[PDB]
Design a protein around this ligand. Structure first.
Ligand SMILES: Nc1ncnc2c1ncn2[C@@H]1O[C@H](COP(=O)(O)OP(=O)(O)O)[C@@H](O)[C@H]1O
Ligand SMILES: [Mg+2]
Lengths: 97, 96, 295, 145, 149, 49
């Protein structure tokens, strides 16, 4: 407050830190047939998506298997557990920095 | 060569800004299939293409729908369709 | 009842015709056609039973009970007799060559088809075209339309209707859409030919993909052709009239260019030799004047 | 997601009207549309993801479960209970839903019937607001006079 | 019936609508003014109250104070009282944007398409009453202001 | 990678150092967060990057 910050900005900072701490609650599992990941429970997914207020279904499809703008064509490629994790901490570090 | 130049010219006529990634949808119109007394190789290739795409449609529909049916595999049993002509079209070329 | 006494059996005037159930002996029955009263013997169990006669002009053949064909043919010819050309089956559509003209392409109908459910209006190719855009937008991407048929019949009108409809929907004042539309006349008149089966022809395989945005509006396009029949030129026979370009630019131009050029008559041409008078299409003013204005 | 539209030729006379049955019969026999009829009679032609079905069709539920931010599959089960359909009409998948033809149209019919009371009630509320405003205007005009 | 202050308000409204003679009461008049007097629903009331579909003459339709009262108290039992939840849910379903970018066009379409119908006069009084900017309300402030009678 | 530093020898380890060095990212989610509801969560990515 003394620095000249309204309370709403502090609330927004708290929202950002809450989002980054809640982002790691996502749990994935194998598809039992291929390397594709499986997402059975979206509780934390719904919480975090509403925390940034973006479309979860688009977010879910993108994060679980993104479409590559490779330039050749439009293609979505199956990912693995390590790829999804790497995306998770990449987003976390970018947000915090 | 004149036809090639004119089609490149109409391309450049439709060569507006080329943005990339948003969306698209394709439309195709193939040449027809005819049975006339005197034919060259090109019309044979066109008929082969028509048979190829008909086989593509049949295989796509039946085989793919049934393979998702197994992929979820909740409550399903194998059903008989047949109607495959891939060996017929394979006779075009295979030096093996 | 309980048999309808009119079950279809194969015939010759039509593929299948009715049969009157009567005394049967080891599947041998001398059925008579109720439409003709002609007792004909039959042993094979070729029964094509009907639904009760109350489902006139079924919108989609899924409410039926017997998967017969003569009733299907009856429905198809009933739809044909009334100009309802856009009947469809499960998950796809089928049409028959009309050989006639109907005013079904009115702009009011185009507005009336704007964004409705599949089961709201009678089926029409514009309805599929409009449903395609919403189908593309609701899911991620990559809509496609594929059509396929014996020889060339409708292989071009449906694509033209789709292009016109998407141009009408394309908005945000329509010069780019007009250019895209008039592109097809250019290639068509420069690519059409005359053939025994149809004096309207298509000497190539034509493909096009529209380019959309977040709003779904035209930004650009590209067309790739496939294997024009090169040999058509020199060879010439009955109805083997090479191309409309020569037949209508032989004289469809100013006399000044005639003096400048070295054009000849229908007989003086060593290469060209036939009677081209069976051309009831137009009077070839369009082919050069409208092509010039489009270019 | 390909979509197909076929075409047939009714004769060789190249004229209009009075077609012949057996030619188009052979054409449809070779095209095998009858196989598509078999699959539409037997196979399940509709696949829908759980979440979009949950959000899109909720008015007919009439029991708005407030347990937000969890229980997607449980919400699907509750909606199935709210649909009271026989076991054959549904087959819940791992991520999609298996139905048969005709249920969707019934859904839009029900929801379009339902929304009518809400929209007319809002219209009546707006009418009441306008009536109150007009009465206040007349009263203030009278007192000014 | 309540105490006589509602009767006094009815008498002062009776004086208020004195056009074409104060004495005779028209169903068109009383329904509209009583809607202004805290009765939002009027669609089904044209048939439920009168019990007769004869809506021909707007000049001389027989309604008297003596029978206008007991009918009103029978209607005063609040046959139905909707609340904002269903209204906002229906508007959100009707909302194609969720924030109010361009609402006027489809609001006009739904009003001219609705069964009870709205003439364009309602369209120009729509822009008043805090509904001036193009979708300035996300269907909650308009709900509060319309539920103020 | 044992080397003698300011004070003494130290112990290192390779744990995909190049992966930490490049620090990949997904453009799809980055583009999604370019347009968001709340002003500040947009401010976290409103800048061109
Ligand atoms: N959908 C249609 N509506 C009206 N006329 C059509 C239609 N399809 C084809 N025709 C008529 O049939 C002729 C051949 O057209 P089409 O089959 O589209 O091209 P092609 O014969 O090269 O495949 C045209 O001259 C046209 O008048
Ligand atoms: Mg063609």
């Amino acid at each position: 407050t003394i620095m000249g910050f309204t309370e709403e900005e502090q609330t927004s900072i708290l929202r950002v830190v809450s989002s980054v701490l809640q982002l790691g609650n996502i749990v994935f599992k194998k598809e039992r047939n291929t390397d594709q990941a499986s997402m059975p429970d979206n509780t934390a997914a719904q919480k975090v998506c509403h925390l940034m207020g973006i479309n979860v279904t688009d977010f879910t499809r993108s994060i679980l298997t993104p479409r590559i703008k490779v330039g050749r064509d439009v293609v979505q490629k199956a990912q693995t557990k390590e790829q999804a994790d790497f995306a998770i901490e990449a987003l976390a570090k970018a947000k915090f920095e | 060569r004149l036809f090639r130049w004119i089609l490149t010219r109409v391309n450049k006529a439709l060569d507006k800004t080329k943005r990339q990634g948003a969306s698209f949808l394709g439309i195709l119109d193939i040449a027809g299939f005819e049975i006339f007394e005197i034919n060259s190789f090109e019309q044979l290739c066109i008929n082969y293409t028509n048979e190829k795409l008909q086989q593509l449609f049949n295989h796509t529909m039946f085989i793919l729908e049934q393979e998702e049916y197994q992929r979820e595999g909740i409550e399903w049993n194998f059903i008989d369709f047949g109607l495959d002509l891939q060996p017929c079209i394979e006779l075009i070329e295979r030096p093996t | 009842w309980s048999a309808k006494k009119l079950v279809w059996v194969p015939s010759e005037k039509h593929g299948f015709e009715a049969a009157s159930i009567k005394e049967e002996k080891g599947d041998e029955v001398t059925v008579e056609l109720q439409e003709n009263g002609k007792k004909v013997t039959l042993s094979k169990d070729d029964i094509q039973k009907m639904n009760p006669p109350k489902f006139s002009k079924v919108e989609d053949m899924a409410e039926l009970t017997c998967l017969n064909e003569a009733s299907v043919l009856h429905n198809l010819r009933e739809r044909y007799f009334s100009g309802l050309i856009y009947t469809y089956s499960g998950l796809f559509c089928v049409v028959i060559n009309p050989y006639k003209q109907l005013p079904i392409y009115s702009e009011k109908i185009i507005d009336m088809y704007k964004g409705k459910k599949r089961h709201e209006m009678p089926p029409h190719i514009y309805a599929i075209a409009d449903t395609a855009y919403r189908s593309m937008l609701q899911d991620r991407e990559d809509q496609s339309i594929l059509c396929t048929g014996e020889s060339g019949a409708g292989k071009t009108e449906n694509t033209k209707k789709v292009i016109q409809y998407l141009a009408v929907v394309a908005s945000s004042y329509g010069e780019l859409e007009k250019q895209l539309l008039q592109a097809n006349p250019i290639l068509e008149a420069f690519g059409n030919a005359k053939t025994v089966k149809n004096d309207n022809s298509s000497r190539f395989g034509k493909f096009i993909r529209i380019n959309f945005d977040v709003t779904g509006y035209i930004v650009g396009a590209n067309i790739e052709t496939y294997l024009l029949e090169k040999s058509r030129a020199i060879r010439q026979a009955k109805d083997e009239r090479t191309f409309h370009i020569f037949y209508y630019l032989i004289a469809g131009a100013s006399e000044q260019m005639r003096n400048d050029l070295l054009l000849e008559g229908f007989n003086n041409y060593t290469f060209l030799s036939n009677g081209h008078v069976p051309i009831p299409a137009q009077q070839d003013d369009e082919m050069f004047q409208e092509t010039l204005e489009a270019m | 997601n390909p979509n197909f539209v076929r075409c047939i030729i009714p004769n060789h006379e190249k004229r209009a009207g009075k077609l012949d049955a057996h030619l188009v019969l052979e054409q449809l026999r070779c095209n095998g549309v009858l196989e598509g009829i078999r699959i539409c009679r037997q196979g399940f032609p509709n696949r829908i993801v759980f979440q979009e079905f949950r959000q899109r069709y909720e008015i007919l539920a009439a029991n708005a479960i407030p347990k937000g931010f969890m229980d997607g599959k449980q919400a699907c089960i509750l909606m199935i209970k709210a649909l009271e359909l026989d076991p054959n009409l549904y087959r819940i998948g791992q991520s999609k839903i298996f139905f048969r033809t005709g249920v969707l149209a019934h859904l839009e019919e029900e929801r379009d019937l339902k929304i009518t009371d809400v929209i007319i009630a809002f219209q009546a509320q707006c009418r009441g607001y306008l009536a109150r405003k007009a009465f206040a205007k007349r009263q203030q005009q009278l007192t000014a006079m | 019936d309540f105490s006589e202050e509602q009767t006094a308000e009815f008498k002062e409204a009776f004086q208020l609508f004195d056009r074409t003679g104060d004495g005779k009461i028209l169903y068109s008049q009383c329904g509209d003014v009583m809607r202004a007097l805290g009765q939002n629903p009027t669609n089904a009331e044209v048939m439920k109250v009168l019990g007769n579909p004869k809506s021909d003459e707007m000049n001389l339709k027989t309604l008297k104070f003596e029978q206008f009262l007991p009918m009103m108290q029978t209607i005063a039992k609040n046959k139905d009282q909707g609340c904002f939840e269903d209204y906002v849910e229906g508007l959100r379903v009707f909302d194609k944007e969720g924030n109010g970018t361009v609402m006027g066009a489809e609001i006009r379409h739904v009003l001219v398409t609705l069964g009870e119908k709205m003439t364009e006069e309602e369209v120009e009084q729509l822009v008043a009453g805090h509904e001036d900017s193009n979708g300035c309300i996300n269907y909650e402030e308009l709900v509060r202001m319309v539920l103020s009678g | 990678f044992c080397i003698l530093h300011y004070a003494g020898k130290v112990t290192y380890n390779a744990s995909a150092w190049l992966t930490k060095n490049m620090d990949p990212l997904n453009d799809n989610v980055t583009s999604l967060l370019n347009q968001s509801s709340d002003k500040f969560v947009a401010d976290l990515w409103k800048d061109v990057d």
